[PDB]
Design a protein around this ligand. Structure first.
Ligand SMILES: [K+]
Ligand SMILES: [K+]
Ligand SMILES: [K+]
Ligand SMILES: [K+]
Ligand SMILES: [K+]
Ligand SMILES: [K+]
Ligand SMILES: [K+]
Ligand SMILES: [K+]
Ligand SMILES: [K+]
Ligand SMILES: [K+]
Ligand SMILES: [K+]
Ligand SMILES: [K+]
Ligand SMILES: [K+]
Ligand SMILES: [K+]
Ligand SMILES: [K+]
Ligand SMILES: [K+]
Ligand SMILES: [K+]
Ligand SMILES: [K+]
Ligand SMILES: [K+]
Ligand SMILES: [K+]
Ligand SMILES: [K+]
Ligand SMILES: [K+]
Ligand SMILES: [K+]
Ligand SMILES: [K+]
Ligand SMILES: [K+]
Ligand SMILES: [K+]
Ligand SMILES: [K+]
Ligand SMILES: [K+]
Ligand SMILES: [K+]
Ligand SMILES: [K+]
Ligand SMILES: [K+]
Ligand SMILES: [K+]
Ligand SMILES: [K+]
Ligand SMILES: [K+]
Ligand SMILES: [K+]
Ligand SMILES: [K+]
Ligand SMILES: [K+]
Ligand SMILES: [K+]
Ligand SMILES: [K+]
Ligand SMILES: [K+]
Ligand SMILES: [K+]
Ligand SMILES: [K+]
Ligand SMILES: [K+]
Ligand SMILES: [K+]
Ligand SMILES: [K+]
Ligand SMILES: [K+]
Ligand SMILES: [K+]
Ligand SMILES: [K+]
Ligand SMILES: [K+]
Ligand SMILES: [K+]
Ligand SMILES: [K+]
Ligand SMILES: [K+]
Ligand SMILES: [K+]
Ligand SMILES: [K+]
Ligand SMILES: [K+]
Ligand SMILES: [K+]
Ligand SMILES: [K+]
Ligand SMILES: [K+]
Ligand SMILES: [K+]
Ligand SMILES: [K+]
Ligand SMILES: [K+]
Ligand SMILES: [K+]
Ligand SMILES: [K+]
Ligand SMILES: [K+]
Ligand SMILES: [K+]
Ligand SMILES: [K+]
Ligand SMILES: [K+]
Ligand SMILES: [K+]
Ligand SMILES: [K+]
Ligand SMILES: [K+]
Ligand SMILES: [K+]
Ligand SMILES: [K+]
Ligand SMILES: [K+]
Ligand SMILES: [K+]
Ligand SMILES: [K+]
Ligand SMILES: [K+]
Ligand SMILES: [K+]
Ligand SMILES: [Mg+2]
Ligand SMILES: [Mg+2]
Ligand SMILES: [Mg+2]
Ligand SMILES: [Mg+2]
Ligand SMILES: [Mg+2]
Ligand SMILES: [Mg+2]
Ligand SMILES: [Mg+2]
Ligand SMILES: [Mg+2]
Ligand SMILES: [Mg+2]
Ligand SMILES: [Mg+2]
Ligand SMILES: [Mg+2]
Ligand SMILES: [Mg+2]
Ligand SMILES: [Mg+2]
Ligand SMILES: [Mg+2]
Ligand SMILES: [Mg+2]
Ligand SMILES: [Mg+2]
Ligand SMILES: [Mg+2]
Ligand SMILES: [Mg+2]
Ligand SMILES: [Mg+2]
Ligand SMILES: [Mg+2]
Ligand SMILES: [Mg+2]
Ligand SMILES: [Mg+2]
Ligand SMILES: [Mg+2]
Ligand SMILES: [Mg+2]
Ligand SMILES: [Mg+2]
Ligand SMILES: [Mg+2]
Ligand SMILES: [Mg+2]
Ligand SMILES: [Mg+2]
Ligand SMILES: [Mg+2]
Ligand SMILES: [Mg+2]
Ligand SMILES: [Mg+2]
Ligand SMILES: [Mg+2]
Ligand SMILES: [Mg+2]
Ligand SMILES: [Mg+2]
Ligand SMILES: [Mg+2]
Ligand SMILES: [Mg+2]
Ligand SMILES: [Mg+2]
Ligand SMILES: [Mg+2]
Ligand SMILES: [Mg+2]
Ligand SMILES: [Mg+2]
Ligand SMILES: [Mg+2]
Ligand SMILES: [Mg+2]
Ligand SMILES: [Mg+2]
Ligand SMILES: [Mg+2]
Ligand SMILES: [Mg+2]
Ligand SMILES: [Mg+2]
Ligand SMILES: [Mg+2]
Ligand SMILES: [Mg+2]
Ligand SMILES: [Mg+2]
Ligand SMILES: [Mg+2]
Ligand SMILES: [Mg+2]
Ligand SMILES: [Mg+2]
Ligand SMILES: [Mg+2]
Ligand SMILES: [Mg+2]
Ligand SMILES: [Mg+2]
Ligand SMILES: [Mg+2]
Ligand SMILES: [Mg+2]
Ligand SMILES: [Mg+2]
Ligand SMILES: [Mg+2]
Ligand SMILES: [Mg+2]
Length: 245
RNA sequence: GUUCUGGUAAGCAGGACUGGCGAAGAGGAAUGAACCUGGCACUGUGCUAAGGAACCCAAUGUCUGGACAGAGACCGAAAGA
RNA sequence: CAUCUGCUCUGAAAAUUGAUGGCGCUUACCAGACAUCCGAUGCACAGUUAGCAGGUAGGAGGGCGUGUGUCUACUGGCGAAGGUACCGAGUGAUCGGUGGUGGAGGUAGAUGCAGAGCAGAUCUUGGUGGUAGUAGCGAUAAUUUGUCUUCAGCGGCAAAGACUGAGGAGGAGAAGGGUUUCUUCUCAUAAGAAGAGUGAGCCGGGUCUAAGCGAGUGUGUAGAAGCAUGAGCGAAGGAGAAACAGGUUGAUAUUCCUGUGCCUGUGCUGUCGUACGGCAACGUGUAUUAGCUUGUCGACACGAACAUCUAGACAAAGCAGAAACACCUUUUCUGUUCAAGGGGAAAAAGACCACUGAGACGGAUCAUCUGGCGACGUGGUUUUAUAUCUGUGACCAGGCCUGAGCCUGGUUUGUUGAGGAUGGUCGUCCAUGAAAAGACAACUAUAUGGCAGCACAGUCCGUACCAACCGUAUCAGGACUCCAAGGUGAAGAGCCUCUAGUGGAUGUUUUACACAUGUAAGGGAAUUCGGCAAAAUGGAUGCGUAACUUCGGGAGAAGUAUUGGUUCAAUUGUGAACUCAUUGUGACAAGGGGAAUCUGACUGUUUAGUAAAAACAUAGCUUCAUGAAGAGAGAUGAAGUGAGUUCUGCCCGGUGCUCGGUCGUGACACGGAGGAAAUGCCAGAAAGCACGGGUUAACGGCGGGAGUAACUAUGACUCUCUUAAGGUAGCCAAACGCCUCGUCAUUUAAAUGGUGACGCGCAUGAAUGGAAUGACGAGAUUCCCACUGUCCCUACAUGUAGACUAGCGAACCCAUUUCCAGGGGAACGGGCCUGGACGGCCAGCGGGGAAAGAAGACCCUGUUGAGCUUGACUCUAGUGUGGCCAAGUUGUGACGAUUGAGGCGAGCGCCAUGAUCAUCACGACACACUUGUUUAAGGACAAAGGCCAGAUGGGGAGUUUGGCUGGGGCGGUACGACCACAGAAUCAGAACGUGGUCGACCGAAGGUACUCACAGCGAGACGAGAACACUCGUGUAGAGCAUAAGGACUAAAGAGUGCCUGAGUGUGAGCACUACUGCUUGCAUGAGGGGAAACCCGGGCCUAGCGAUCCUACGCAUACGAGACACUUGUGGCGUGGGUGUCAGAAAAGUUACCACAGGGAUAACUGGCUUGUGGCCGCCGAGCGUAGAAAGCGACGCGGCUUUUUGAUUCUUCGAUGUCGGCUCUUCCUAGCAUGGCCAUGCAGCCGUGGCGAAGUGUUGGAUUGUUCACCCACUAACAGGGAACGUGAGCUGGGUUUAGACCGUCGUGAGACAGGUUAGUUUUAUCCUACUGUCCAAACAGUUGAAGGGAGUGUGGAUUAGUACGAAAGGAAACCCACACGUGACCUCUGGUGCAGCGGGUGUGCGGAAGUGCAACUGCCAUGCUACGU
RNA sequence: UAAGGAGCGAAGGAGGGCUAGAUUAUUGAGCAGCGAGAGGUGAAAUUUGAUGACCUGCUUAGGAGUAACAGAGGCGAAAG
């Protein structure tokens, strides 16, 4: 047969375009700074708003981008790095923040610029500090617990734009605007409605799959469709998670 | 043509024996691949075959019995007056 | 009288008109005989001749002709070759001469070399016919008259008549074209030839940057591709310094000329400058370069309402000129202009500054709103149009003259108003709506800078025209944009007009059949698969509006009434009166409505060119995988179901996916033992596999049999088999039910239909999603109201073609000689045989030419393909897993490998610890390697490369998927062997002919020598019987012989008993159609067997139990071995084993309804032919039955025929094509007689019937369900018989069924896919030829006639009278003449319907100044003549 | 007013909402010790354990609850 939809959309001419982008998002590199928030802006592909910051490096003014936490305003002064106060919207070394606190834009290793929590409405929880090893345990929004060194930086607050998934998209055109900038195929034609030249689920005198939909992790790429390496299937209840800090 | 097997049968399917048409014209059965007479270079005079002999159409008449049905010369059964 | 033989007779019915061959024959027949004649390529005689002589496929011998070579002989201007008429020679292929034409070359003989002879190939190229002066050439607005040319153009010009109608058939640009544009001449004309024509600082290109492309460099490659970075490039419609009027040419113009300007720079001469004002909001002053830095401009979505301006359009008055006047009118028409640049208001809308000090309150918008972070008020500051003036006069209208110049006007007011411009507000979004070049301000330094005059400069390329573009063209198609008047009306709708633009194949009143349209008595879907098509409804205003519903909707529900003109009131609500001959959204424009069911939630999308859908999408719901990112779990990808409401039961046995451990297996490397060494051997061994768990909103799956309740039925209850679990809740003859047209109710006169119920449901059912509704479908289906030419049943009229005529002018197709009936024939003839008939012409028509299209698409065959699937065969990319490979450095412990000095148990193995090399975790440093944490972080790990080895692998690649066969498939095996039967008494001998057997078994069931029988039957012998052991007599096999069938065997070949391993070893010859195989037989040998010996034995009493080349295993002796020699491996020879059952021997699964190619009537799906089982119809006999009684009527059990209208059986004709079911329409034939006419019998009183005979003239209907033929009901009737003609009839129609490609359901399949199972959507071409048929002319002067031959026509019902009569116990109950009607036939318009071309009238919208006369769009009342039936 | 509402003074109660903490217990994982049974009942079987259960240590992760004191005691319109 021919090449399936899933492979074609991974070729280079289909990658997302950057022409409307504001810049690369991430923290400054300097040990200490005082910054001012210049503007709060929407960026074409992203639902969380961005804040433009201004800080001096040598004598010269320089500009950066952060993801906005909820409760900043244009004109606010913010303090970055060691010796910053625990005030909403400051950036601090993680070892300085008390247990049970909520944080965003956490660095996985020092000076990486911030990864981890970046989507609207999300946060992470500080669950443990180890005074020997200088590690800290953070609980991520998937439920995963990960350990990071005390020298990493983090932003104090919750990411702006929460609640967005409460309102249903009642019409086809509303879905159109949401997926127009994403990589997923919309509208999505079902594999059982294709001919066998186009998809492993195609063909036959009734619309059916005909073979089990759970497939191996090591299966060849042009036929790896369906539920890939599923441990279980169906709507029944699972089992207890195992937890360590 | 003579015989045989399967089949209700068939211008049906399949064997055996002796001549044909295929690869065979000519005269005769009104017409017909295979039936009757009889096997072909080219001319001329006579004679016969098979089949014909009121007329179409070259050659026809005679004797003795049957037969009356728009019958027969071409043409079907068991049963009958 | 009884039998037998001959001829006649009865049994004896088929579809166009018919066949002893015809006409005829009764003395042309049947049977028995007789005469002699006619008749072959045969026979006789005679010529010619080698004479011995037919011939496909095929084979051989001898000759004729063509282009060129070598030689010999000749020839041509006193006319060569060629070509054309005649004449001679040869059986023939061919050859020779004569007379005209032609104008320079040509042969005869013998040999040599070959591109060496045409009727055909749907042959190749070129040229020409018939058809044929024919088919056609005419969609759109429309044309007439005069006059000149033209020389014969509806060409030009005047006057009329029309049309596009400002979302134009008008005026311009772009893409595309490229001289098509202008002048002259000529026909050569959508034709040529010769010239001429496009002028810029201010218009556009050359500039900037979007999405993006990229030279070079780095890395890579055999060279490439690719990847990282990046000079340069990227928009004639995005950003982008500065121009406008009026004139002029045959053709250019914001480009030329005149006038008035502007931008960017340069230089001269004058003339001034080095600062101030306001509480403030800010002003006055035309101001230099340069630089940091901060900001602004360039610089931006959609939608709605409200202001203001400008084009435009109206109406009054003034003047100037036009139109109209039988009448009337100060009625009607055209005009009344002002650019860029300069100067400049009031106004409206917002910002802001000073004083002031406000509320349970003031201000303010069409709408939101607004104020102590300062309201109202009073005075100011600033930003954004426009009117008006100047632009020095141009331009327009009119008058007077004129081959030129003068003169006069261009004045005032009101209403409205963009489809253009601008301003400040408001709404929407999980969508927030480009960059850069180039500018400007503030701040800091620095200063000869501003203005006026005059002068200079600004390169290069494009510039004509389009009705001329793309479609083979002068093609009804396609193709990016701009400007836009008046009336009617909501409206750049339709209809009518102003500005501007427009047109030719000719004449004829022109039948039939058409194509676009009108109208119709009475009836109203009776029509048809089906209301398909048409009709009906229609705008605005008011009254009045149901079920159900997600509460939004349904809803314009439905149902009803009103509407013109005039003259008034009243001011947006509307009222009232008067008036008209059909009435008023008058033309144009403009919904039919209701009740239910199946199905998809909705708007949206799709097979360009047969499918618009129930299919796809969609919002919502659920599952899965991941912490990797230029992205970071409200994320990023993969699947399934299909909005909302309400539910979503049970199963982890199989298959898959996933998790955990090894107990076993499982590669290469790395080790070990041995040997002179190679080859082998042993250990070792990840992941996988196996094993144990999880998982169905994963693939999917979800039962049988017996009994049992006070009538019968049914079974809550019991028992029994069975499993992974035995279909829960719901729903149903449903788009899913075979039987099936299921049963009951309702709808109709009548229901293979619809709806409601019921349910052991062939084969319903839960995100392979189940069930009940709303709103919305060019979706499928049933019914009702309105409405109608769909129909009964057709008639009349209009336009355009068509017929005839002038001008112009083709194609398909074609072996062609073409009237029928029967016969035969390749089984349906135009041509052949025997009969019936025989002409040409013009216009129509569709019976035939199995008419033309196109090497049948269905079906089979080919050792021909391609797309797609998987549990087919053999490989492969990707993904995982192991060991090894760039000398990192140094610590600690550990297991392991190798050998000593210790200890235990009757020097052994076992237990202690001490030295020698690898080596697995763990630490701590920095040097390889990694990362924009980069003057940095990690770190010998990772990540990325390389060489070998295992695992997985329809993600892909190649290929295969036997044969015979009363077509193929499914089934069997007639595919290798053996016996019997038949195949007309040797042997042989076919069919999916008949009865069967084989793929082995046995140390004896083999070899030998000797002994004796057997199966039974008749007597006996205790328990002891039908049947126990023992005896005597008979006993030709009635028994046995392992295993089919046949043959064979008696002191044995059978049953016993003894001994043996001949079921030896070498090597020959033969038989069975004889290779393999099986058997028969010769000679030589054994320290061979059995027997006294003669004799016998190298398997089974005889006929069946089996297999090549190459490779490999074993036995046997004799060989070979590379320069030489020794050994371990190897190679030769003979013979046996390991195996091919498709058995004279490839290594192999499906599907195509998406389909291709070569062929086949060697072979299926129609018709026809032969047959007639089965279907249908008729005879013979007489057992019984009929109230008696064989036979009025019947007729068992048996027996003989006919028919082709049923279905089989067979494969003769057609696969380079004979259009396939039913209906509609129309004609003819058959009889086996339903009605109607004449008769005979009766169990015939009469009435009504029943059985038969001669007879085919005239009849045999309207409907409901269904695609039906068929069936079954209702209504009528004299009666509602049965059939044929290529299952009559598609260049006659229709297209409901079946049977291409889309899609749903059930059952089957792991799947792609299947299903004489159900459902819905699905392109019907061409006559102009010949012949037939129908009419028309000629053959046939004119007037009056004749009648050969051909055609043919009237059929039936009722009433009255006989008569309440005959006849019958009664009840009942018949038989001419006359009159009324229906169907059919032929005519006719006096009457009555219908139609409206000629004729008279009326109104609506808009044109010609009014009235009168009238155009266009079309509407409407009456109606001559004519034609017609619903009339006579 | 030994009718009602407003208010003052000292005090009492498991009455209610919110914020920040707590001693144990029941399960689950990690690691260590030991080496055969644990559980459950009237009596037993399903079941789990040499992949080391049970019991005893140390670590951790969660989500409920407030024993004994505690009563013919208190509070609230009732539910509590
Ligand atoms: K997308
Ligand atoms: K499909
Ligand atoms: K499928
Ligand atoms: K499905
Ligand atoms: K299945
Ligand atoms: K032949
Ligand atoms: K012969
Ligand atoms: K003859
Ligand atoms: K024959
Ligand atoms: K004669
Ligand atoms: K005759
Ligand atoms: K005779
Ligand atoms: K030829
Ligand atoms: K030939
Ligand atoms: K018009
Ligand atoms: K733009
Ligand atoms: K000039
Ligand atoms: K516009
Ligand atoms: K130009
Ligand atoms: K108008
Ligand atoms: K109007
Ligand atoms: K207009
Ligand atoms: K209009
Ligand atoms: K109907
Ligand atoms: K029907
Ligand atoms: K139709
Ligand atoms: K309600
Ligand atoms: K309705
Ligand atoms: K009306
Ligand atoms: K109309
Ligand atoms: K739909
Ligand atoms: K719509
Ligand atoms: K549609
Ligand atoms: K699913
Ligand atoms: K979905
Ligand atoms: K549902
Ligand atoms: K299972
Ligand atoms: K399973
Ligand atoms: K049930
Ligand atoms: K059913
Ligand atoms: K029925
Ligand atoms: K019914
Ligand atoms: K089922
Ligand atoms: K099911
Ligand atoms: K389920
Ligand atoms: K539709
Ligand atoms: K006419
Ligand atoms: K004409
Ligand atoms: K015949
Ligand atoms: K025949
Ligand atoms: K014939
Ligand atoms: K013919
Ligand atoms: K015709
Ligand atoms: K015809
Ligand atoms: K380090
Ligand atoms: K370093
Ligand atoms: K460091
Ligand atoms: K394949
Ligand atoms: K056969
Ligand atoms: K035997
Ligand atoms: K050697
Ligand atoms: K050598
Ligand atoms: K072998
Ligand atoms: K074979
Ligand atoms: K398909
Ligand atoms: K047939
Ligand atoms: K055919
Ligand atoms: K058809
Ligand atoms: K009769
Ligand atoms: K008749
Ligand atoms: K047709
Ligand atoms: K005369
Ligand atoms: K006559
Ligand atoms: K009349
Ligand atoms: K009339
Ligand atoms: K007009
Ligand atoms: K409290
Ligand atoms: Mg596939
Ligand atoms: Mg489905
Ligand atoms: Mg002959
Ligand atoms: Mg003679
Ligand atoms: Mg020959
Ligand atoms: Mg040659
Ligand atoms: Mg000459
Ligand atoms: Mg040749
Ligand atoms: Mg004509
Ligand atoms: Mg018109
Ligand atoms: Mg118009
Ligand atoms: Mg138009
Ligand atoms: Mg021209
Ligand atoms: Mg310009
Ligand atoms: Mg450029
Ligand atoms: Mg531009
Ligand atoms: Mg011009
Ligand atoms: Mg200008
Ligand atoms: Mg031009
Ligand atoms: Mg009518
Ligand atoms: Mg009427
Ligand atoms: Mg009908
Ligand atoms: Mg219709
Ligand atoms: Mg229903
Ligand atoms: Mg739609
Ligand atoms: Mg189509
Ligand atoms: Mg269509
Ligand atoms: Mg769907
Ligand atoms: Mg749903
Ligand atoms: Mg619910
Ligand atoms: Mg049904
Ligand atoms: Mg019907
Ligand atoms: Mg029903
Ligand atoms: Mg189903
Ligand atoms: Mg004939
Ligand atoms: Mg063919
Ligand atoms: Mg073909
Ligand atoms: Mg073959
Ligand atoms: Mg192939
Ligand atoms: Mg291919
Ligand atoms: Mg396989
Ligand atoms: Mg075959
Ligand atoms: Mg024996
Ligand atoms: Mg022997
Ligand atoms: Mg063979
Ligand atoms: Mg045949
Ligand atoms: Mg028969
Ligand atoms: Mg027939
Ligand atoms: Mg044809
Ligand atoms: Mg043919
Ligand atoms: Mg035909
Ligand atoms: Mg008769
Ligand atoms: Mg037919
Ligand atoms: Mg026909
Ligand atoms: Mg159809
Ligand atoms: Mg189909
Ligand atoms: Mg359709
Ligand atoms: Mg008229
Ligand atoms: Mg333990
Ligand atoms: Mg307590």
């Amino acid at each position: 047969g021919k090449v399936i939809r899933t492979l074609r959309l991974q070729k280079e001419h289909w990658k997302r375009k950057h022409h409307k982008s504001k810049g690369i998002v991430g923290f400054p590199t300097l040990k200490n700074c005082e910054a001012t928030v210049e503007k709060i802006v929407h960026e074409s592909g992203r639902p969380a708003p961005l804040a433009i910051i201004n800080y001096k490096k040598e004598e010269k003014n320089t500009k950066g981008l952060l993801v906005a936490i909820e409760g900043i305003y244009e004109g606010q002064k913010i303090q970055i790095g060691e010796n910053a106060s625990l005030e909403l919207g400051n950036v601090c070394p993680i070892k300085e923040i008390p247990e049970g606190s909520l944080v965003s834009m956490v660095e996985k290793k020092p000076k990486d610029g911030g990864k981890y929590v970046k989507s609207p409405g999300c946060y992470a929880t500080i669950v443990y500090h180890n005074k020997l090893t200088n590690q800290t345990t953070i609980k991520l929004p998937s439920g995963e617990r990960v350990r990071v060194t005390g020298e990493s930086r983090a932003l104090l607050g919750i990411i702006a734009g929460g609640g967005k998934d409460d309102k249903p998209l009642l019409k086809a055109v509303n879905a159109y605007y949401k997926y127009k900038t994403k990589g997923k195929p919309w509208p999505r034609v079902r594999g059982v409605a294709m001919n066998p030249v186009d998809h492993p689920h195609g063909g036959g005198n009734h619309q059916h799959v005909g073979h089990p939909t759970t497939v191996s992790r090591n299966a060849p790429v042009n036929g790896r469709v369906g539920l890939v390496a599923a441990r279980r299937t169906g709507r029944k209840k699972g089992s207890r998670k195992i937890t360590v800090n």
